[PDB]
């Protein structure tokens, strides 16, 4: 049986509020092994956290995680956690527990907004290779998920990182080249899927 | 409990695939213990958007499931990763760890990519669409598609006046086929700025364009 830790699943939250997260872990005494917290911020580095002695239940921070950060656990439970109170938008960031440099956690996704659960509109971009495509505008949160002709279309298909625009609200197009010859004949659709808003879109791009 | 710093190097590589790279982690302490003869140093992999995978520990031994063109080496306070053989699924972020001291500290990372002929983009300009400017607003698109290296240049400009502070860029990974890269502008107005301009271009700027080139349209055509 091989060592595994369940992290809880994606978390939203506004600022001001308090998050608890945990780590769940099976295949071994727990209590022989101490667990780690790593933050990982969204195109940057990895920041250790800390660790919790899982015999004592012992805390050590790192300084920049002194006071709105607790470890705890509860051992009968083989679980640890990691709270976070008084939450900023800069703790929005994937979290993984670990036993160490050995064995990490899947990660818990951590998205802290004032923004509220939004779907997005979809707008066409029109178009011997021509470019059209899909604009998928002011969604919350992420993700989206585009496909094109039912997934069917994958070759010359380029989705690209959403942008955080200052409404708050994330925004993103996807586009594909085709053969010009094509766009008599063949029709072209993309499906858009936002789950959070429970929005799905397919929509039709033609040529004006 | 000491704060020691790792130092990676370089910050960013760019190799052809199939050749040899090299990646450097320094300490300022030594990670040596004389107790056990081991280098408490690690190095991770990190994918676009995937979490950290452990490649080699105790600064050489490499990970199950990690393949043989990986080779960690070193001691004390230095300490290398190579790629003997650099492939294009290796496009990731490389970061060293240590956990000799508390509290434990990563490097500040290397990231890797691959290297090919440089290629130039393929610009496509979007006007806004009807649909959309029934809600008050326009995006103009701007497409810079399948291009190396990744350093591109693109400015808006509204009947030849140059725009600022109103568009915004997002750009792909290294594609894994072709190795190039793709990025969009969007240009964001209201409605009624839209309405007032009637000349909307783009120009993008690339090593592999002998000269800047434009896209642009006329609203109503
Ligand atoms: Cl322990």
């Known amino acids: 049986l091989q060592i595994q830790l369940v992290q809880s699943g994606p978390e939203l939250k506004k600022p001001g509020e308090t998050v608890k997260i945990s780590c769940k872990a099976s295949?071994?005494?727990?209590?022989?092994?101490?667990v780690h917290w790593v933050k990982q911020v969204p195109g940057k580095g990895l920041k250790w956290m800390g660790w919790?002695?899982?015999?004592?239940?012992?805390?050590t921070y790192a300084d920049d995680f002194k006071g709105r950060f607790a470890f705890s656990l509860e051992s009968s439970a083989s679980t640890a956690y990691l709270e976070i109170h008084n939450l900023k938008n800069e703790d929005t960031a994937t979290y993984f527990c670990?036993?160490?440099?050995?064995?990490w956690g899947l990660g818990t996704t951590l998205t802290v907004s004032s923004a509220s659960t939004k779907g997005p509109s979809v707008f066409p971009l029109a178009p011997g290779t021509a470019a059209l495509g899909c604009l998928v505008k002011d969604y919350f949160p992420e993700p989206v998920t585009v496909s094109w002709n039912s997934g069917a279309l994958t070759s010359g298909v380029h989705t690209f990182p959403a942008v955080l625009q200052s409404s708050g609200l994330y925004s993103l197009s996807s586009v594909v080249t085709v053969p010009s010859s094509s766009l008599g004949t063949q029709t072209y659709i993309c499906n858009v899927n936002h789950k959070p808003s429970n929005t799905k879109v397919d929509k039709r791009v033609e040529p004006k | 409990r000491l704060d020691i710093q790792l130092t990676q190097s370089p910050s960013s590589l760019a190799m052809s695939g199939g050749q040899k790279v090299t990646m450097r982690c320094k300490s300022s302490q030594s990670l040596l213990n004389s107790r056990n003869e081991r280098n408490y140093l690690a190095w991770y992999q990190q994918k676009p958007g995937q979490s950290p995978k452990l490649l080699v520990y105790?600064?050489?031994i490499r990970e199950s499931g990690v393949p043989d063109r990986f080779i960690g080496s070193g001691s004390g306070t230095d300490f290398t990763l190579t790629i003997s053989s650099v492939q294009a699924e290796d496009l990731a972020d490389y970061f060293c760890?240590?956990?000799?001291?508390?509290?434990?500290?990563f490097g500040g990372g290397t990231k890797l990519e691959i290297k090919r002929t440089v290629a130039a983009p393929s610009v496509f300009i979007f006007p806004p669409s009807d649909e959309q400017l029934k809600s008050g607003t326009a995006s103009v698109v701007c497409l810079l598609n399948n291009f190396y290296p990744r350093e591109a240049k693109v400015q808006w400009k509204v009947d030849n006046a140059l725009q600022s502070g109103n568009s915004q860029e997002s750009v792909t990974e290294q594609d894994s086929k072709d190795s190039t890269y793709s990025l969009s502008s969007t240009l964001t107005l209201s409605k009624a700025d839209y309405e007032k301009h009637k000349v909307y271009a783009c120009e993008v700027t690339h090593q592999g364009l002998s000269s800047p080139v434009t896209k642009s349209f006329n609203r109503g055509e």
């Open positions: 295949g071994y005494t727990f209590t022989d092994y101490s």
């Open positions: 105790f600064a050489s």
């Open positions: 670990a036993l160490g440099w050995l064995h």
């Open positions: 760890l240590q956990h000799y001291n508390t509290p434990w500290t």
């Open positions: 919790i002695n899982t015999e004592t239940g012992e805390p």
